[PDB]
Amino acid sequence: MVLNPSQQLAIAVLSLTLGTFTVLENLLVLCVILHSRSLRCRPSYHFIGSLAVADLLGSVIFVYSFIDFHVFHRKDSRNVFLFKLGGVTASFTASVGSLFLTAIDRYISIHRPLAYKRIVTRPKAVVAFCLMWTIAIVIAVLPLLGWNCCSDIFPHIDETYLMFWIGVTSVLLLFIVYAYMYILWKAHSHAVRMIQDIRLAKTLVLILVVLIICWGPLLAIMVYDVFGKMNKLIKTVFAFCSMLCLLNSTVNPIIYALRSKDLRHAFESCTTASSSLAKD
Amino acid sequence: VQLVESGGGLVQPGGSLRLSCAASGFNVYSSSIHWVRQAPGKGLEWVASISSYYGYTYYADSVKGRFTISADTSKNTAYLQMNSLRAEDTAVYYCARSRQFWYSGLDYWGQGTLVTVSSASTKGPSVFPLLGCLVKDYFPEPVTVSWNSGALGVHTFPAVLQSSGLYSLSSVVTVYICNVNHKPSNTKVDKKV
Amino acid sequence: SDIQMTQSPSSLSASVGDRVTITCRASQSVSSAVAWYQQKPGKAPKLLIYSASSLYSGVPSRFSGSRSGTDFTLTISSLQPEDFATYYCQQYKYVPVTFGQGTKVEIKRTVAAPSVFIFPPSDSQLKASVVCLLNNFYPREAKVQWKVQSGNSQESVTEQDSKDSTYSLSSTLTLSKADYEKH
Amino acid sequence: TRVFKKASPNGKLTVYLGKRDFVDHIDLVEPVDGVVLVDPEYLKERRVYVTLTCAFRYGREDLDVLGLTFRKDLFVANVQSFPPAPEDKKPLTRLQERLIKKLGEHAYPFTFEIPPNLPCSVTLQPGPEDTGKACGVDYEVKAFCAENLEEKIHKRNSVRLVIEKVQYAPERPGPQPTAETTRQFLMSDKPLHLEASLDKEIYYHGEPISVNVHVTNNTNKTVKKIKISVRQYADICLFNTAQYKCPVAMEEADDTVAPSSTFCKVYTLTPFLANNREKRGLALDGKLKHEDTNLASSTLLREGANREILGIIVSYKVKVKLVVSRGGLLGDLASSDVAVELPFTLMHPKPKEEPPHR
Ligand SMILES: COC(=O)[C@@H](NC(=O)c1nn(Cc2ccc(F)cc2)c2ccccc12)C(C)(C)C
């Protein structure tokens, strides 16, 4: 409903380009990591593929809805539009849930180095993934009935639901950041213990931090709307921040999936012998 | 430290039998138990082995399937279950132990149990005075021969098997009553030469 | 792999105090994993040397083991009258474990001629078996036949007599009852 | 005697080593001494270096952690074998002198003095699905021809042997292990007393272990089962101070004790590898190649020694557990249990030879 003529075409083209680029990357990664031999049975590969598919679906649906909102101004109703918004929240919460799964998987791997074999496997990994998708879909459909009223930005959604969803997403993000901070701490710890891990882990943590900067502002604007919801330009600021979140969608899978040398590569020894030694 | 073997006796060809080797002073987990058979007038041949610490069990290629080796660690005993015995399995079976960790030869041996797989049935000997005395057509062994009732250049040819299945022995003294005792048939003979 | 060990010689004559050497040749290479047993008649073998160079605890120091390439040697430096038995050779590196043909160590003695004796079939046994006998001769090998015609005869020889260190061959030949008067 | 020899695939460099089991006395370690035969006509200007690395692969080899290496190199020693004695003069062991006599004048020595406090060669059982390099610390002697230490070493002209660092049972057994506990429930103000003790402290692999259990149940509660379990603790120090208990032998005897009664018995159990095949993560004694080896021997680390460096420390404990009833006049089907632990040593006797995976 709100779209400045100068910002209208700008945000339209930005969203189109970001969505196209993200869907291309995600399609490539999910094709490259389906049916393969070692890139399939591994649980980390499973989580990465789940994140890629989830974020691709989310990007497609979100770009469609955003274009329909800021260009076509469909606003067909407070329910069908609510169906599209439910799809968007399902996709985004599923993506955050897959990041959380990966983070917990790495945390347990580094807590018990030999536990990766005995605590996480192919069946249990998919069980956890389907549990995450189930909680995602139930959260997504809860608005389908509980929208009693409030939301200055989203038209026909409840207000306590917004706070609850921000809470769950924020706690998941807190758990992820804690997991990776603890991983870096343990990395530096073994390094100091063994010199009697320096830059690679730093850059990876910084990449994840950049992902948080891309994703962080959304929750800030949601909570500000929950508390004050007084100003008007906040809606356009939130449109821009959601564009940034889409850029998060593009940056996340490549950083998770393309930064692996072995995964990219997937896409003479003699034998001991004896000899007598003359006794002196 | 005394492995003792038992359970060996005559069996019709194609029959069964069970040899038991009881080990005293050995832990079946710190020792590996082997069964080695020696044919009459022949070199030693390895027939089976069991190492319980790993659960490994090996057999000689000539006794695959027919022979099964097991171990009862509760009684510290080893068993060889011999089924479908051919005529080539007649021999003295000795049970040996080897240090389980870093095998260093067969340390201790059993006294060996005879196993005679022949189709012939128990029979009595026939004596011919030829001064030499011959005994023929006697089975199984052994047979005792005494010249002059034990008071007689004395030679006794070791029992020689015949294709018929029965045995044959002979005794000669250079120059009385030749007392012949046949224990497995419990017979007594006396010929005056 | 099935490794065949050849122990030579298959017989020996040696007097007390002489040096006795028995050799064992392995088909393939066995890395010093060879043991030497000693089985006296009747009794069961007894380990003497393991690893081709070590001595089992409780063995006289005269026995020695040596290796060169794939040829192992057991040497009794000063033979004693209790060291005259059959010595074997095991190669326990590859399953199945394989033993040698067995070397028998006799006692050297002065040559002694046999005493040929003949025995025609008896009435009870030929109501049959012509018996040829040689006694107190040396060496064990005999290449003299009794006057008879070569049938199927089983030859039996006693162990080296303790008293005179001699032997005795008591062979019997079976044939028709009508061929007993021609000898 | 016999000396082991490996040859580089190019064939221009060979490593001669006296033995592949280097016993670890607690005070000091036997030096790793050997010879390297090179081809001067081939190494026209490059030098010939030798290294002794102590690799550690606690992380799953079949897997990988992004941006991090689960591996570690606790010890890495270097020596410039060719040219000879560049740094300073070093004594030659009689073995090195004999090898130099046997080999031409193109053979040069190398010797490593391992620091006392370092892990022993241990490997973890991989299970029926894993493959590749076996998880667990292990040593390697690698000789190569390089112009500089940091230059990449072509694998076609470098030769690596796998050596082992092993410890043998202490010659003087220590005090007999023993333990005792006294529990007191909320039902009766009388103590249930348990006392256990092993026959000796040092056990050799395969030797049965005897536990002399003695229980006095002065309380009004009945004990149903008695569980004796030999279990293995593997203190790993890759990233944390983890602990991995794993029962290597068990015996569950249904020998009850009436209230206000006594029960003395001797339970014999032997830990062996036949029935512990499926237990992934079990620490085995270490192998040169894929082969069979017993359960990992205990580690005789020096008392008061810093534990930070140690890679894997193995120890064993016999745990006696009484499953005491919890039934009462009114209540649930609960059944508490008292427990006691006895530490012992499971090592080999000091041998004159130890063929690893013959
Ligand atoms: C920018 O104009 C928007 O409102 C766009 N939606 C989002 O930007 C957006 N909608 N949801 C689902 C959601 C979150 C909290 C809640 F209480 C109920 C539903 C997102 C979730 C994560 C990041 C961006 C979004 C829209 C026009 C495409 C609908």
Write the layout of secondary structure elements.
The complex is a heterotetramer of chains A (280), B (193), C (183) and D (358).
Chain A lengths: L4 H28 L5 H4 L1 H30 L7 H32 L3 H5 L2 H20 L18 H35 L5 H28 L6 H24 L3 H6 L6 E4 L4
Helix pairs in contact in A: 1-3, 1-9, 3-4, 3-6, 3-9, 4-6, 4-7, 7-8, 8-9
Chain B lengths: L3 E3 L9 E7 L8 E8 L5 E8 L4 E4 L7 E6 L4 E7 L7 E9 L6 E4 L3 E3 L10 E4 L2 E7 L4 E5 L6 E8 L5 E7 L3 E6 L4 E6 L1
Antiparallel strand pairs in B: 1-2, 2-7, 3-4, 3-8, 4-5, 6-7, 8-9, 8-10, 11-12, 12-15, 13-16, 14-15, 16-17
Chain D lengths: L1 E6 L6 E4 L3 E3 L8 E6 L9 E10 L15 E11 L11 H9 L4 E6 L10 E2 L13 E9 L11 E4 L2 E3 L11 E6 L8 E6 L4 E3 L4 E9 L5 E14 L9 E8 L7 E9 L13 E2 L27 E13 L13 E10 L11
Parallel strand pairs in D: 3-11, 14-21
Antiparallel strand pairs in D: 1-2, 2-4, 4-7, 5-6, 5-9, 8-19, 9-10, 12-13, 13-15, 15-18, 16-17, 16-20, 20-21
The structure holds the ligand COC(=O)[C@@H](NC(=O)c1nn(Cc2ccc(F)cc2)c2ccccc12)C(C)(C)C.
Keywords (chain D): Cell membrane, Cell projection, Coated pit, Cytoplasm, Cytoplasmic vesicle, Membrane, Nucleus, Phosphoprotein, Protein transport, Signal transduction inhibitor, Transcription, Transcription regulation, Transport, Ubl conjugation
Subcellular location (chain D): Cytoplasm; Nucleus; Cell membrane; Membrane, Clathrin-coated pit
Pfam families (chain D): Arrestin_C, Arrestin_N
